[PDB]
Design a protein around this ligand. Structure first.
Ligand SMILES: Nc1nc2c(ncn2[C@@H]2O[C@H](COP(=O)(O)OP(=O)(O)O)[C@@H](O)[C@H]2O)c(=O)[nH]1
Ligand SMILES: [Mg+2]
Lengths: 179, 127
């Protein structure tokens, strides 16, 4: 069977693990959220052909910087993640994540993925963001960064509401089946 | 622009069914995965289930065998060579963090703790 290996990468607390659990189980986790997603593989039918899809989470904290890339070999697509209510995480896409994956997997395509979009329209998050100056990241400014850093595209989702969730992984599968 | 994509979700740990077990001829990347898994399990034993990331990564070294084996690159074989040293440095750093230990004492503890746990693991490999 042909195999798609997808690796999810990004800052701590952006929602990497929950995005993976909500997508694979169709449930948002509150009771069991490991730091790194449990081992997962599934059958995907793509144009009548069966593919193995393997989804790999990572630990984004700098303590693991020398251990994290052990899971990069043979990766077919990366998901580079940031929360749309964390400008800090958006910044690290440019300065840490894309430099990291392109140093190890220099021709492997990647999507830029915005997470937690249900917090864009939640006052307390905007309230907290107004203090020390920040606003949520918009699809516009995020699409620019994706053009700049040569991501396949920008996609967006909420693990909590499941909005856009299916599409993120459809696009990833497509980006994996490429030149 | 787009094929019909249907994901066949299944409940539970099905992933073991998807592993490709057949070894490459020279320089098996899969064998590399096995050694790295063994090293990560040793560091997880030392840190004593205070750090579940190491165990999760060991688990991933198995999951990684969903991709068919091939000969390893030089960056991959060097990474597997550098891994022990890097795990010891993590343990060391952690021991300065949690405990009061000065860096050189922490490193010494880490090297010895790792060496000894590695020996126990090797001597507990089943027949
Ligand atoms: N409101 C909301 N919260 C989320 C979402 N995804 C994750 N979270 C929360 O963000 C925190 C970190 O999520 P986690 O999956 O562990 O992030 P990770 O460190 O990148 O793996 C947790 O408290 C989650 O409940 C989301 O889509 N919406
Ligand atoms: Mg996580």
């Amino acid at each position: 069977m042909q195999t798609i290996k997808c690796v999810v990468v990004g800052d701590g607390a952006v929602g990497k693990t929950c995005l993976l659990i909500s997508y694979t189980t169709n449930k948002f986790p509150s009771e069991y959220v490991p730091t790194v997603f449990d081992n997962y593989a599934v059958t995907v039918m793509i144009g009548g052909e069966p593919y193995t899809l393997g989804l790999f989470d990572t630990a984004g904290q700098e303590d693991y910087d020398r251990l994290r890339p052990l899971s990069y070999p043979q990766t077919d697509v990366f998901l580079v993640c940031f929360s749309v209510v964390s400008p800090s995480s958006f910044e690290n896409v440019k300065e840490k994540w894309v430099p990291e994956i392109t140093h190890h997997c220099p021709k492997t395509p990647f999507l830029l993925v915005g997470t937690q979009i249900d917090l864009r329209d939640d006052p307390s998050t905007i309230e907290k963001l107004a203090k020390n100056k920040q606003k949520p990241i918009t699809p516009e400014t995020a699409e620019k960064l994706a053009r700049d850093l040569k991501a396949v595209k920008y996609v967006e989702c909420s693990a909590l509401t499941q909005k856009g969730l299916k599409n993120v992984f459809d696009e990833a599968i497509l980006a994996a089946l490429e030149p | 622009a787009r094929p019909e994509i249907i994901v066949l979700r299944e409940p539970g740990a099905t992933w073991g069914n998807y592993l490709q077990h057949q070894k490459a001829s020279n320089h098996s990347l899969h064998n590399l995965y096995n050694l790295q898994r063994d090293l990560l399990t040793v560091a997880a034993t030392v840190l004593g289930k205070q750090d579940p990331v190491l165990t999760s990564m060991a688990n991933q070294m198995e999951l990684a065998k969903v991709k068919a084996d091939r000969p390893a690159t030089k960056q991959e074989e060097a990474a597997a060579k550098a891994l022990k040293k890097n795990l010891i440095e993590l343990i060391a750093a952690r021991t300065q963090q949690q405990d009061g230990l000065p860096a050189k004492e922490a490193h010494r503890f880490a090297a010895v703790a790792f060496r000894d746990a590695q020996v126990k693991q090797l001597n507990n490999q089943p027949w």
